[PDB]
Amino acid sequence: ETTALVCDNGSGLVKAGFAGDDAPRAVFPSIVGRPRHQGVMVGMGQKDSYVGDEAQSKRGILTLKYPIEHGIITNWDDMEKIWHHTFYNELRVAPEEHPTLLTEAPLNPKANREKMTQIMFETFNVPAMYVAIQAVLSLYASGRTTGIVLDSGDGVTHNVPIYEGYALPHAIMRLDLAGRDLTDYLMKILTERGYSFVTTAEREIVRDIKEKLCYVALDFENEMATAASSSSLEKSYELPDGQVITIGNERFRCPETLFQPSFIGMESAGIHETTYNSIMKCDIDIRKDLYANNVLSGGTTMYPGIADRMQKEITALAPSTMKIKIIPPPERKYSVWIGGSILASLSTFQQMWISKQEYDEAGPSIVHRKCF
Amino acid sequence: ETTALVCDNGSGLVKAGFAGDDAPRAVFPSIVGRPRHQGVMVGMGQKDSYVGDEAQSKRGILTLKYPIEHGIITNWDDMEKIWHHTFYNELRVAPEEHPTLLTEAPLNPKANREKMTQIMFETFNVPAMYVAIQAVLSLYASGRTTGIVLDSGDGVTHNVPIYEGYALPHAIMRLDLAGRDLTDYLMKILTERGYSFVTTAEREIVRDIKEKLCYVALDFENEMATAASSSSLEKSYELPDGQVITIGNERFRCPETLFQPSFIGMESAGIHETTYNSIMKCDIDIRKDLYANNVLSGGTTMYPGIADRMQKEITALAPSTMKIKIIPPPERKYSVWIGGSILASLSTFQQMWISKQEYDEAGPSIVHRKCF
Amino acid sequence: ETTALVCDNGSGLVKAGFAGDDAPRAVFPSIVGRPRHQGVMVGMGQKDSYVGDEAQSKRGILTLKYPIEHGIITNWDDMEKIWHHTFYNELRVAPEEHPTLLTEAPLNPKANREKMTQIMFETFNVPAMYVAIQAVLSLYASGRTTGIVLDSGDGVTHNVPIYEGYALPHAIMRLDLAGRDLTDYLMKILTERGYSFVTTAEREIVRDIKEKLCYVALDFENEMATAASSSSLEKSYELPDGQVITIGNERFRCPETLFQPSFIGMESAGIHETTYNSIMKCDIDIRKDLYANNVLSGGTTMYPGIADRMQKEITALAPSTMKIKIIPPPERKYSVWIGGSILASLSTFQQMWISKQEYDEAGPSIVHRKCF
Ligand SMILES: Nc1ncnc2c1ncn2[C@@H]1O[C@H](COP(=O)(O)OP(=O)(O)O)[C@@H](O)[C@H]1O
Ligand SMILES: Nc1ncnc2c1ncn2[C@@H]1O[C@H](COP(=O)(O)OP(=O)(O)O)[C@@H](O)[C@H]1O
Ligand SMILES: Nc1ncnc2c1ncn2[C@@H]1O[C@H](COP(=O)(O)OP(=O)(O)O)[C@@H](O)[C@H]1O
Ligand SMILES: [Mg+2]
Ligand SMILES: [Mg+2]
Ligand SMILES: [Mg+2]
């Protein structure tokens, strides 16, 4: 009868739907807005706070505030609000009937899972739930059983090396360089040309510019030398009001930070080094099989030409007597949700849900003992 | 109708097959491994422990453990498991019909044979069984009937002098220096160059390096002096992950342990002295015939140039007026199994099986009174 | 006239001083720091690299990097720099006059000692030098002459059984678990509570937390059970900027990796097992004395209550009819240097130095022929 409810709870977007499908049904930004002006107009259905896609449409008035920051939820009051919205106004189902499946980034605060389970068992009264790691669901979706995954969302970037089904918990690195940092860096470096973006609403415009105009350069120095005699690199974008801007070497300087994290003045290894370091933390016999299965998930890994530079850069580190392959699917943006649907549809998994009667016995602490 | 089922269940490898052939059918390592990680997957065909050549392919996960140590069985529970594997998954033959011939090392604990007979007669319900010594079977395979044999496997090294059909049980020396100590010594002296191997998985890599890169030097001092100006001795080996290691005078230092057991910190005489002492313990009238028949069996004796040094070394001890010949058959690695096949094929031997109804009357104590 | 210079150059700190004393004069962390920022300020005496305590004072800017890792020296250029620092800027003596006494861990790559000899005989032009083992020097300072020493520093942990003046080279175990691994594990498990430390500058902060706030539990299960109803276990530590942090059952979980190394997911026996296995590798006639003389040295062995658990754990392994004693001195942190001073002060030891004229004839290879 009832099957599941699979909702990937990212930092940027709330991707959600039913189990067993090939694509999520609801995809909206995870923001909640609150008005900040006089509001002298009468009627017109003025609500206290606009959440989801409606907030993005009217951003010129409200002050957007993301409830999820760096993967850790910090505004639980708004979080239950956005969950209520996605369950009622977007799917139009009763959450009390269908079990739900959730996702969380690894090495996360321990209280976060407890409070998530408590909220989903008290306010919504679901029958069952389960918390999964995104990096294993991506490899679920990819269809293989062994490999190393480089997830890269909006707030957190991490690796999980997994052999033929056996995870290695001591090789799970996690760096806090993600999409929001790139957006901030682009906003900062656009000032050199003359354009200044400050308001929370203009952060969305800068994010859109990054989404629709940025690419990863295969060779940074040669690209800079070419941009010195700037002929065919500059592009044009149209602001909502009508002004046209031109960005040149900012096109490939912004996404490079993933490879040279010193551009934001933080001493860390780029995404091409954390993968290699996480591979080198496993015992020697499996590095050959890990090298040949590199899976890219997450939205931030969707820049053009990222895979080519990842190959060209990792090949410089690994020994020369072996091959390296990266496996970017064209539909990686919903890889976590696809994997969650695949896991929820399985028959063997039906015994791993957390029953309500089980939770009443042991309290919210059951999540650590049962889920992982 | 039925002929036999002989399996040279040594310490290192389990060599098994049918009588009357010229080579065994199943040759696999005698290791049983158990995983050590949580296994976040689902399904994928889990066994609690992988036995035989399957475990050797997944050593990146498990903690391999040899059930047989120094010839003496220590972990019967896995011993019956690997015997079950041998009978079913590799030979595909019903043990309830074919009689089996087992082998053991001399000067072994009394309880070992008793437990072996009890397990074979209760768990597998064989009709007949018999336990023989490796050193006589290797001579049997060699085809002669008078000579002294130096067996050297993975856990035990021993000598058994045989005159014309008559053994000499009062002159059977046995030193516990074997291949495993050589592997550990190579692991220890490889740290001098810089490479450190610790886990059970890397012991296999070190063992393979020993197998395909070590040799026995005729004159140790001259070889060291040559290695002082190291030009044409060093070789290269490629590790599973890609790194290449170079080992120089570590090549001939490892297998010299058999000749100077003081390298591994034990007060004992080498294999070039135990054979001589065993020969000198027999009466004077057979030493001339024993000196001319030296049969080398077992895997450990497969180093290049071992026979030549053995000859040059025993010649120095024996009187100068008589000759020495060390017969090193080419296939000696399977000599014990060949001899077991020859012994089980013969018609005369068919009266010395231990019938099940005979075992019922007297219990498992029949093995000592009947086998030897 | 001239007496000696004992410079115990361990992995974590460089403890140095003169012979004949009861405590070293120089104790500073063994790091070298390099700036990474704009440096727009003029003057102020900005140096290229800060070495020693000065770097530890300005960690907010520099990128600290240890030149010695796991006892093996990897950055010789920085190592000679810190040697020049300790010789000139702290002791204020001319190295060309006084002889120096160095120390190193056993089972180290051969090239380390040779390069140490070359550096000390070419760059500084010392008259004579000698290299010792920490484990024997700690027993030397302890005052006895028969016992088993468990040295456990910052990079290496090794055991050396000693009978009445005769060392047993075939029973020197060595596991690579030390204080740095504990610091990394504490950094990783602090993220469960919510505190994230990534910067190399914050590793020092975590190390200070570990030094001043953690202890070894006698019974792990009972301590966890009491921590379930956490009342009197949490303690408060103040960060340099002003925030306070509170850790509960994290106080005793970090030092429990010494005894259960499976927490870092590496396959080795705990320090209570390597000592016992090293005892069991010796001949049967010295174990009774080895049991009753257990000497602990090194900084890592200074956790409160380590001796009680070590005794309770070794008693459970040894035969029940013979007694176990552990001898932790109150000042065991400097025991290696105290032993070095004692050894260099003696008159009989005067004939074992490596003379410069002797080194010229034979080159840097003399260390292996003379020292050990
Ligand atoms: N075409 C694109 N180019 C660059 N970045 C993109 C693009 N599309 C999405 N992104 C980035 O991906 C992120 C959204 O991914 P998301 O679905 O939130 O994954 P997760 O839910 O795991 O965080 C956004 O932060 C955005 O910056
Ligand atoms: N080519 C080789 N070079 C050196 N040693 C070898 C070689 N082949 C096998 N060995 C050694 O021989 C041993 C295998 O002998 P094995 O068949 O187990 O004798 P048994 O069955 O009597 O124990 C292994 O432990 C290995 O160390
Ligand atoms: N009070 C303490 N509690 C716990 N650990 C300590 C304490 N004091 C020092 N240590 C540890 O001791 C180590 C320093 O020992 P060290 O003098 O470097 O030995 P060695 O010089 O032989 O390496 C450091 O890694 C530190 O973690
Ligand atoms: Mg995602
Ligand atoms: Mg053999
Ligand atoms: Mg120390």
Sign of the torsion formed by the C-alpha atoms of B120, B126, B128 and B133: negative
Q: Which residues pair with B17 in a beta bridge?
A: B6
Paired with B104 in beta bridges are B133
The alpha carbon of C133 and the centre of ligand 6 are apart by a number of angstroms equal to 11
Q: Are strands B157-162 and B147-152 parallel, antiparallel or unpaired?
A: antiparallel
3 state DSSP class of C132: strand
Structure-token match 């296939």, residue found: B331
Q: Which residue's CA is the closest to the ligand 1 atom numbered 4? A: A211
Q: Which residues of C98-118 are buried (b: 16+ CB within 10 A; e: fewer)?
A: bbbbbbbbbebbeebbbbbbe
Environment of ion ligand 4 (residues, CB < 5 A) = A 10, 153, 298, 336
Shortest CA distance from B243: residue in chain A: A319
Ligand 3 neighbours by CB, cut-off 6 Å? C 10-13, 134, 153-154, 179, 207, 211, 298-300, 302-303, 333, 336
Secondary element (H or E) of residue B139:
helix B134-142
Whether C4 contacts C352, CB under 8 Å: no
Q: How far apart are CA A217 and CA A303, in angstroms?
A: 10
Q: Using only C-alpha atoms, what is the Rg of chain C?
A: 22
Sign, Cα dihedral of A191, A196, A199, A203: negative
Give the minimum alpha-carbon distance from B59 to chain A in angstroms, rounded to a whole number: 7
Residue C136 structure tokens: 């024997």
Could you tell me the two tokens for C332?
């065991």
- Indicate whether residue A11 lines ligand 1 (CB < 6 A): yes
Q: What is the resolution of the experimental data for this entry, in Å?
A: 3.6
How far lies A366's CA from each of A102, A109, C7, in Å?
15, 16, 54
CA-to-CA separations, B250 to A368, B188, C72, C309, C352, in angstroms, rounded: 50, 11, 21, 41, 29
C306-315 and C271-280 helices, crossing angle to 10°: 50
DSSP state of B91: T
State how far the Cα of C151 lies from the Cα of C336, in Å rounded to an integer.
Answer: 9
- Whether ligand 1 lies within 6 angstroms of the CB of A299 is answered as yes
Contact (CB<8Å) B38/A168: no
For residue B130, the cross-strand partners are B101
Classify strands B244-247 and B235-238 as parallel, antiparallel or unpaired. Answer: antiparallel
Give chain C's domains with CATH numbers. Answer: 5-38+49-134+335-370 (3.30.420.40), 140-176+269-332 (3.30.420.40), 179-257 (3.90.640.10)
Q: Choose among C30, C114, C119, C36: nearest CA to C69.
A: C30
Q: What is the DSSP letter of A304?
A: T
Structure tokens given for B276? 């001589």
Cβ neighbors of A134 (< 8 A, separation 6 or more) are A8, A103, A104, A105, A151, A153, A297, A336
Overall size of chain C counted in residues: 372
Residue nearest to atom 7 of ligand 2 (CA): B211
Of B138, B333, B337, B338, the one to substitute when testing ligand 2's pocket (max ligand atoms within 8 A of C-beta) is B333
Please check whether residue B19 is in contact with residue B49, taking contact to mean a CB–CB distance below 8 angstroms. Answer: no
Q: Which of A154, A160, A295 to mutate to test the pocket of ligand 1 (most atoms within 8 A of CB)?
A: A154
Interface test with B, best of C166, C177, C267, C280 (most B CBs within 10 A): C267
Tokens of C5: 């210079």
Contact A235, A207 (CB under 8 A): no
Q: Which residue of C has its CA nearest to B188?
A: C107
Residue B198, token pair as written in the block: 């610790």
State whether the beta carbon of B13 lies less than 6 angstroms from ligand 2: yes
Please give the Cα distance from A323 to A339 (Å, whole number): 27
CA B314 to centroid of ligand 2, rounded, Å: 23
Cα angle C279, C282, C287 (rounded to 5 degrees) comes to 60
CB-count burial class (<10 Å; 0-12, 13-18, 19+) for A134: buried
| Strand, coil or helix: A204 | helix
Sorted by sequence, the CB contacts under 8 Å of residue C40 that are 6+ apart come out as none
> Cα angle vertex C118, ends C117, C121, to 5°?
80
Which pair of structure tokens corresponds to residue A232?
């065919």
- Say which of A133, A166, A319 has its CB closest to residue B242: A319
**Helix runs in chain A, H state only:** 53-57, 76-85, 110-122, 134-142, 179-189, 200-213, 220-228, 250-256, 271-280, 287-291, 306-317, 335-345, 356-362, 366-370
The three-point CA angle A162-A71-A135 to 5° equals 15
Query: Which residue, A292, A301, A247, A244, is CA-closest to A272?
Result: A301
Q: CB atoms < 10 A from the CB of A2, how many? A: 10
What backbone phi and psi angles, to 5 degrees, belong to B79? -60, -45
Q: What are the strands of the beta sheet with A5-9, ordered from one edge?
A: A26-29, A13-18, A5-9, A100-104, A129-133
DSSP assignment, residue B318?
S
Dist. CA B39–CA B345, nearest whole Å:
48
DSSP at B347: S
CA distance A219 to chain B (A): 27
What ranges in chain C are assigned the alpha helix state H?
53-57, 76-85, 110-118, 134-142, 179-189, 200-213, 220-228, 250-253, 271-280, 287-291, 306-315, 335-345, 356-362, 366-370
Pairing of strands C174-175, C157-162: antiparallel
What is the C-alpha separation between B319 and A215, in angstroms, rounded? 86
Largest Cα–Cα separation, chain C: 73
Rg (CA), chain A: 22
User: Are residues B200 and C267, on separate chains, in Cβ contact within 8 Å?
Assistant: yes
Using an 8 Å Cβ cutoff, are C220 and C251 in contact?
no
Angle between helices B271-280 and B306-317 (to 10 degrees): 50
Atom of ligand 1 nearest to the CA of A210: 4
Q: How far apart are the first and last CA of chain B?
A: 27
Quick check: A109 and C63 CB within 8 A?
Answer: no
C171–B200 C-beta distance less than 8 A: no
As a whole number of angstroms, the distance between CA A64 and CA A334 comes to: 24
Nearest to B60 by CA among B33, B29, B31, B30: B33
What span, in angstroms and rounded, lies between the C-alpha atoms of B206 and B211? 9
Q: If 0-12 CB within 10 Å is exposed, 13-18 middle and 19+ buried, where does residue B281 land?
A: middle
Ligand 2 touching residue B35 (CB < 6 A)? no
Q: Are the CB atoms for C112 and C73 separated by under 8 Å? A: yes
Q: What is the DSSP letter of B52?
A: T
3 state SS for A317-335: HCCCCCCCCEECCCCHHHH
Judge contact between B65 and B29, C-beta under 8 A.
no
Cα–Cα distance for residue pair A298/A35, rounded to 1 Å: 32
Give chain C's contact residues with A (Cβ, < 8 Å).
36-37, 63, 188, 191-194, 196, 198-200, 264-266
From residue C81, alpha-carbon distances to B357, C5, C30, C33, C124 in Å are 83, 18, 11, 12, 12
Length of chain A: 372
Sign of the CA dihedral A39, A43, A44, A45?
positive
Minimum CA–CA partner of B185 in chain C: C170
